Design a protein around this ligand. Structure first.
Ligand code: HEC
Ligand code: HEC
Ligand code: HEC
Ligand code: HEC
Ligand code: SF4
Ligand code: SF4
Ligand code: SF4
Ligand code: F3S
Lengths: 121, 55, 952, 110, 164
């Protein structure tokens, strides 16, 4: 399901650029230091929309990767081949599934879910 | 690209001509072939006083 | 790839112009002719190039106002399809070769007396050209002039000869006319003296609090027009029955005429016309249209004389048309001489005879009989392609010359640039035929106008826009009762009739290459890029066999919305092709539904179907000139409609012809308006809320605008006639692009101002027409600004709505939140880039928009910025630090173009300004007030002055 | 540098339209020939100037101060309100070759 | 990296054009064409000749502001190359051998005012049809307004008085 969210957000993230008519200027909706001194309005809903999709995509990606870390460890433990290893190994960050690590993992996952619920809403 | 620094101008300039002429245009004086000088911004008051032929 | 911008070279002069300050536009006084009659124009040259045309306040017939053709002459001059070289037989040739051939051909004519030599010009009013033609006729006695143009005034001069026994010019002073009656007279349309008549009429209709009188307009027309819109009472009579209507009107007033069997509605209309007349003697005028037969003109002169209007509202002058004549009869005589083979040389000066001549004359076939054909067309027109020795003609904006307006004024046509592709004028050719080749157009008009008004008079004439010495003298002709009484007075019949009318935007078809006019939505029809057969819904139902009752459109107020829904369902039959058989011709033109049309009458618009026009309009519309006949050029007898199925796509800019019971257009009566000017606003609000005042409350503070300038605009509905002059002025001033017919079909027209007609009332087959101009309302709390994420649309210190093109990313959200939908988007690349002449027509003070940005009305900000800068500079140069702007200092393009003066722009805070006084009226209101937008562009409710005999 | 600091020509002798319009006039070849018809005549450095004025061809100078055409600058209002060329174009009187003193950003105007 | 409306299809003041022959979008003046409400009736306002000869008079009376404007236009256009105080001593005459005229000589002291006007307008003398010839004063018709030309002539008279 979360994989479907990341892919659906990736597909939905093209229409705000494609429908623009001047697509290459999409970064003008982002508060960036410019030679002009112009800001986004922030009173329109498209400025909220830019901040919302960016936060939604980044938080869903880091939450998905946090959930994938133990599975990365189980894959690099069963990868058999040496070069299939070291690929999931750096993805698992050398998980070494142990106590004093599962505690912080469960609490961070609880906080992440409690934060992502009002995010998607 | 630092700001360029042009070479200083050579000695000969127009400044000495303009300073001498504007100093001549004031402080009265006596010319070579004539009688007396009149400072500028004062002969103009004489012109508007005596006037010029019109029409 | 680098350096942000290229090199961008700059090329200055080698010798500076004496009186030009670089970067400062200048204005020159010239003259633009429509149907041979001149109109003084003030044209702007930026750096030696014409860019904008406006009215000449010093010239009669253009008191600060212009028509759509005078505005579009800018783009007509910059057409990339204008002729550039002399063509002997389609072959590029030279001017010296043509001069030698003309001199050799005229030497052969010198052996005769010019019997083979024939001319063919249009309606000539230029004194210089008329004097040179007369001199050429004295040199060649057997030569003939023969002037003709498709939109002429043959019926007017024929009626003047029938009534007075001589040629006279009839002028109408509507400023002292309390009752005006039009007998198929579209005097509020571009024609002779259109701007002056429309201005006087509007200033008589502009009602205020202190106002006490208001004029009334009666019109009787076959096809509705702009004049019928401003009419308090409109009668949709057939085109043939108008002569009998005039006879019955003359008979009822006690004057010699003939009674006619008419409908009860026409009888009640005759009753009211006769009753309002005779009670306003010397305060009335009866106007006969040029389309109506000569007897109608003569009866109108008789009615006006008996009523005492002559000398008060109707004035008679000496003829101002040089030679007044029946042009169609002279064209028949010329084609008869060509068919007999008597002519040996035929010189034509414009007019496009091959395309404009009636179909029964066969001008193209007889044109082969004359060996030498010569034409000046300013384009490679159809006639020039089938002729030898085509000579490019200089545009009126690049040539020396003169012209005469209605009532006679003799203004000078001053050039603004040397001819781009070369090209000679008419008097230069006439001098060439007078044994004077390589003659300069400057010296010709200067030699004629000298020794008559003097050198100081020529200098004063060039300075202003008029010549003070030339004016048609006032004469008093005598009326012949026996001749106008003993006249057949034809009766209607023979079945379905065809009414030939000039196209509102294309005229005789000359402007078919102009993109601005071809794209301009036609009034009352809203069609673009096409031509259609206009007919009433009942006529289409009965003739094409369409499955509709046409009686369901009749009803009361209780079922108005249901009738509007049925009219929407009935509008789905637009586009059905009809095979109209008139007199041996089949036209096969698509149909269109025009509710106000008279039954059993079909209106066909001229000026379409050209084959040798420019890239724009090269194959648009269906040509109606072949079915046009010499015996009757404006009316028809019997026709066969023959519906064929086989639909054709017709394109409209509105697609909805009825306001769905909303507070868009406000109408009242003058009798109730006098007692209380606020009564219209007190209504509606009672039916919507139960109280007389809508206590609208807002949650936003807005801005103050107390001690600062506040720009506002007011549109008077009592003066708008739908002439569409403000749209072409906005296009010419603001570099608005021109999209194709395909892009308009998808609803992507780019126009900052639009006029909407709403066909409302009972019957919906005889509906009152309501024209309303709409642009950016400039809402103080603009909802289009709180939605654009890049802040490209913000508000100004002066209350203006700033739309910045270089910031728009193109979210298209700024348009969805606009309640009035006055924002246009560049969905594709619409602005021209390759054509050099179109690049020369752009106004340098306005950026040309690229693909992906939004546009809307900016109150012509370039003129506001120029006046503000000039005011600040004048304040600091005097040491005042005041910065104060005059009232009339700023004038938007739509304000200057409007000949009626319906648009007023100025400062809101300055109480003595004209806008502040107009906005204080009781009938001043703003559209869609329930949305707390606080618009700065307001409307003045329409007030009517109907007769008690017709209303009760 | 030669024409302002040495010869001593005023700026309005050449850019005559600066205090009246939005555009500072670029000198026509007539202003150059007013002096170089007798000064340094028959010299290679003035060949282009002498080729013009005889033929209607202009001199294609390169714009140093460039604007993206949607900016609309006005020299007249700035000069009449007490703003000098030193604060904008720098010390042009001492430039043998003219350079852009600083980039024409929007924040610079602001 | 953008270049959208940076360079536009419209033709600015001096933007070069490939549609015209001489490569210029700006156009020269039409010979006999005058602007709106600008009448060329008065001859003294536009030429120093009343009958083909000079007059030693001025079309409008002299004003202090008029003399100040003449001094300004003289210092801008006339002072360089021809003398700041009117003696003909300038940096221009040093390089080129211009030898400009001296206003304080007796020939130009008895010269009429309209002679000064026609000299500013046209020049000193064009090339003779025979034995060569060249223009020296070269004229200043396009750069100076006729009223400013009369103000310059009035300031020349004031300079001639200030040196007497
Ligand atoms: C019109 C914009 C021009 C152009 C294109 C040039 N000038 Fe001048 N100039 C003047 C004087 C007194 C000199 C120096 C004389 C000397 O060195 O003997 C110059 C010099 C030049 C040069 C260099 C010539 C060289 O080095 O040999 C060039 C390329 C040049 N100029 C171009 C005087 C004036 C003057 C006031 C009388 C005006 C106005 C101009 N010049 C204008 C122009
Ligand atoms: C008084 C010190 C000034 C100032 C402030 C400027 N000018 Fe000149 N100008 C002249 C010519 C022939 C050119 C084009 C050639 C070139 O740019 O090298 C210019 C150009 C400029 C610019 C830059 C133009 C641009 O497009 O960026 C500027 C900023 C400028 N000028 C200001 C001619 C003369 C001249 C003799 C005819 C005199 C004297 C001056 N200029 C003086 C000044
Ligand atoms: C250098 C380009 C000059 C400028 C700047 C001005 N003038 Fe001049 N002028 C110049 C020369 C080389 C001469 C002498 C010509 C000759 O053949 O000897 C002149 C002449 C005059 C005269 C005398 C006219 C006569 O017929 O004798 C006058 C009155 C005069 N010039 C006035 C004048 C004014 C008003 C100027 C500013 C517009 C000005 N001069 C500038 C060269 C140059
Ligand atoms: C910052 C205010 C400002 C001042 C004051 C100003 N300039 Fe400009 N100048 C500019 C800008 C900005 C441009 C670029 C114009 C453009 O790109 O269209 C420019 C361009 C020019 C040009 C090129 C031609 C043109 O019209 O663009 C000239 C010449 C010039 N300046 C000279 C002058 C002179 C002479 C003065 C008189 C003191 C002056 N400047 C004062 C800012 C200024
Ligand atoms: S507002 Fe526009 S359409 Fe209406 S009368 Fe004026 S110019 Fe014509
Ligand atoms: S009329 Fe439309 S575009 Fe104009 S200010 Fe109002 S909402 Fe914005
Ligand atoms: S005010 Fe200017 S921009 Fe607005 S509609 Fe009128 S002409 Fe067009
Ligand atoms: S939403 Fe804004 S980005 Fe443009 S399309 Fe409207 S001004």
């Amino acid at each position: 399901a979360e994989a479907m969210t990341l892919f659906a957000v990736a597909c939905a993230g093209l229409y705000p650029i494609l429908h623009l008519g001047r697509p290459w200027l999409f970064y003008w909706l982002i508060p960036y230091p410019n030679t002009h001194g112009m800001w986004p309005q922030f009173r329109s809903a498209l400025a909220w929309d830019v901040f919302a999709i960016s936060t939604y995509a980044t938080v869903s990606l880091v939450f998905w990767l946090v959930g994938l870390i133990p599975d990365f460890a189980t894959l690099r433990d069963r990868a058999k081949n040496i070069w299939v290893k070291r690929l999931y190994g750096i993805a698992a960050l050398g998980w070494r599934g142990s106590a004093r690590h599962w505690h912080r993992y469960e609490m961070a996952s609880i906080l992440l879910a409690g934060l992502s619920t009002p995010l998607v809403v | 690209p630092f700001t360029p620094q042009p070479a200083p101008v050579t000695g000969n300039t127009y400044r000495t001509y303009v300073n001498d002429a504007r100093t001549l245009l004031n402080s009265y004086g006596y010319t070579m072939e004539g009688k007396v000088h009149i400072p500028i911004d004062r002969a103009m008051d004489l012109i508007v006083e005596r006037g010029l032929p019109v029409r | 790839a680098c350096t942000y911008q290229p090199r961008q070279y700059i090329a200055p002069f080698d010798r500076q112009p004496e009186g030009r300050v670089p970067g400062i536009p200048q204005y020159f006084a010239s003259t633009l002719t429509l149907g041979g009659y001149g109109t003084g124009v003030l044209v702007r040259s930026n750096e030696g190039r014409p860019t904008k045309v406006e009215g000449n306040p010093r010239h009669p017939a253009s008191l600060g106002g212009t028509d759509l053709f005078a505005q579009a002459e800018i783009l007509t001059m910059y057409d990339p399809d204008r002729s550039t070289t002399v063509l002997r037989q389609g072959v590029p040739s030279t001017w010296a070769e043509f001069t030698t051939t003309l001199g050799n051909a005229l030497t052969a004519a010198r052996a005769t007396q010019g019997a083979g030599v024939r001319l063919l010009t249009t309606t000539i009013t230029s004194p210089s050209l008329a004097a040179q033609i007369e001199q050429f006729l004295q040199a060649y006695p057997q030569a003939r002039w023969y002037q003709y143009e498709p939109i002429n005034r043959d019926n007017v001069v024929a009626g003047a000869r029938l009534a007075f026994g001589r040629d006279v010019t009839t002028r109408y002073d509507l400023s002292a006319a309390q009752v005006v009656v039009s007998l198929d007279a579209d005097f509020l349309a571009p024609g002779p003296g259109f701007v002056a008549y429309a201005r006087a009429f509007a200033e008589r209709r502009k009602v205020r609090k202190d106002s006490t009188t208001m004029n009334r307009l009666y019109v009787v027309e076959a096809s509705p027009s702009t004049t019928g819109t401003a009419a308090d009472h409109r009668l949709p009579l057939r085109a043939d029955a108008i002569a009998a209507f005039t006879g019955a009107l003359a008979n009822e007033l006690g004057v010699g005429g003939a009674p006619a069997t008419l409908s009860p509605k026409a009888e009640e209309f005759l009753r009211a016309i006769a009753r309002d007349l005779e009670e306003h003697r010397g305060q009335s005028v009866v106007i006969a249209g040029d389309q109506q037969p000569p007897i109608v003109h003569a009866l109108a002169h008789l009615i006006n004389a008996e009523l005492g209007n002559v000398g008060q509202t109707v004035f008679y002058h000496e003829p101002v048309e040089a030679r007044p004549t029946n042009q169609t009869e002279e064209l028949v005589a010329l084609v008869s001489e060509m068919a007999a083979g008597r002519v040996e040389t035929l010189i034509m000066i414009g007019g496009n005879p091959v395309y404009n001549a009636p179909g029964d004359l066969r001008f193209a076939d007889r044109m082969a009989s004359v060996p030498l054909t010569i034409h000046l067309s300013q384009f490679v027109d159809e006639t020039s392609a089938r002729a030898t020795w085509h000579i490019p003609q200089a545009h009126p904006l690049e040539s020396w010359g003169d012209a005469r307006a209605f009532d006679g004024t003799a203004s000078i046509v001053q050039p603004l640039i040397e001819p781009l592709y070369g090209g000679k004028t008419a008097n230069e050719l006439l001098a060439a035929m007078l044994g004077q080749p390589e003659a300069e157009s400057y010296d010709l008009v200067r030699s004629f106008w000298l020794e008559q008004i003097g050198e100081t008079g020529w200098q004063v004439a060039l300075a202003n826009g008029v010549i003070a010495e030339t004016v048609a003298p006032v004469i008093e002709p005598t009326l012949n009762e026996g001749a106008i009484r003993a006249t057949p007075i034809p009766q209607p019949g023979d079945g379905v009739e065809i009414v030939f009318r000039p196209d509102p935007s294309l005229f005789d078809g000359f402007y078919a290459n102009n993109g601005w006019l071809q794209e301009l939505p036609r009034p009352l029809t809203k069609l673009v890029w096409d031509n259609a057969a206009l007919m009433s819904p009942r006529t289409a139902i009965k003739l094409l066999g369409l499955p509709f009752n046409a009686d369901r459109l009749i009803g009361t107020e209780a079922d108005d919305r249901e009738r509007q829904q049925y009219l929407e369902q009935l509008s789905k039959v637009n586009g059905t092709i009809a095979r109209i058989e008139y007199r041996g011709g089949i036209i096969e033109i698509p149909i269109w539904l025009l509710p106000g049309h008279a039954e059993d009458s079909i209106t066909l618009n001229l000026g379409y179907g050209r084959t040798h026009a420019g890239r724009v309009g090269n194959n648009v519309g269906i040509d109606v000139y072949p079915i046009r006949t010499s015996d009757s050029p404006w009316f028809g007898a019997g026709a066969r409609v023959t519906n064929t199925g086989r639909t054709y796509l017709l394109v409209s800019t509105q697609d909805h012809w009825t306001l769905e019971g909303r507070d868009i257009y406000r109408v009242g009566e003058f009798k109730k308006f006098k007692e209380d000017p606020k009564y219209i606003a007190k209504e509606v609000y009672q039916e919507e809320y139960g109280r007389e005042t809508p206590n609208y409350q807002s949650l936003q503070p807005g801005d103050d605008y107390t001690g600062r300038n506040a720009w506002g605009m007011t549109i008077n509905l009592n003066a708008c006639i739908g002439c569409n002059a403000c749209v072409v002025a906005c296009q010419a001033e603001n570099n608005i692009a021109v999209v194709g017919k395909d892009q308009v079909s998808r609803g992507r027209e780019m126009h900052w101002i639009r006029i909407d007609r709403y066909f409302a009332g009972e019957d919906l087959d005889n509906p009152s027409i309501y024209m309303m101009p709409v642009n950016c309302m400039q809402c103080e709390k603009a909802p289009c600004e709180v939605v654009c994420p890049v802040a490209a649309t913000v508000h100004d210190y002066e209350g203006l709505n700033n739309m910045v093109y270089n910031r728009c990313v193109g979210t298209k959200y700024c348009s969805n939140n606009c309640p009035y939908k006055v924002r246009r988007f560049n969905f594709l690349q619409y602005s021209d880039t390759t054509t050099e002449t179109f690049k020369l027509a752009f106004n340098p003070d306005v950026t040309v928009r690229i693909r992906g940005v939004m546009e809307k009305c900016t109150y012509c900000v370039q003129r506001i910025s120029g006046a503000r800068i000039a005011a600040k500079r004048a304040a600091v140069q005097a040491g005042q630090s005041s910065y104060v702007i005059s009232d009339g200092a700023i004038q938007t393009a739509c304000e200057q173009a409007c000949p009626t003066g319906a648009i007023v722009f100025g400062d809101i805070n300055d109480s003595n300004s004209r806008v502040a006084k107009w906005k204080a009226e009781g009938h001043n209101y703003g559209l869609l007030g329930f949305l707390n937008t606080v618009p700065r562009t307001t409307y003045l409710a329409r007030v009517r002055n109907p007769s008690e005999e017709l209303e009760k | 540098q030669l024409h302002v600091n040495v010869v001593g020509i005023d700026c309005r002798y050449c850019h005559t339209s600066v205090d009246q319009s939005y555009f500072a006039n670029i000198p026509a070849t007539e202003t150059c020939m007013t002096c170089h018809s007798q000064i340094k005549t028959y010299s290679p450095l003035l060949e282009k100037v002498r080729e013009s004025y005889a033929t209607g061809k202009p001199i294609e100078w390169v714009k140093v101060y460039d604007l993206p055409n949607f900016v609309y600058f006005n020299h007249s209002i700035h000069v009449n309100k007490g703003i000098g060329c030193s604060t904008c174009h720098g010390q042009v009187n001492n430039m043998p070759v003219v350079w852009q003193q600083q980039a024409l950003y929007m924040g610079w105007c602001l | 990296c953008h270049q959208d409306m940076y360079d536009q299809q419209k033709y600015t003041t001096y933007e070069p054009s490939s549609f015209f022959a001489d490569g210029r979008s700006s156009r020269p003046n039409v010979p006999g064409t005058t602007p709106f409400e600008v009448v060329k009736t008065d001859e003294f306002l536009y030429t120093g000749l009343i009958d083909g000869q000079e007059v030693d008079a001025m079309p409008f009376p002299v004003t202090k502001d008029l003399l100040l404007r003449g001094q300004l236009k003289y210092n801008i256009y006339c002072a360089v190359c021809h003398g700041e105080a009117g003696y003909g001593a300038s940096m221009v005459a040093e390089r080129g051998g211009i030898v400009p005229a001296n206003f304080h000589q007796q020939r130009l002291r008895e010269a009429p005012l309209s002679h000064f006007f026609v000299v500013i307008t046209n020049g000193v003398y064009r090339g003779d049809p025979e034995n060569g010839g060249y223009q020296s004063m070269y004229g200043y018709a396009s750069r100076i307004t006729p009223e400013d030309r009369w103000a310059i002539a009035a300031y020349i008279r004031a300079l001639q008085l200030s040196q007497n």
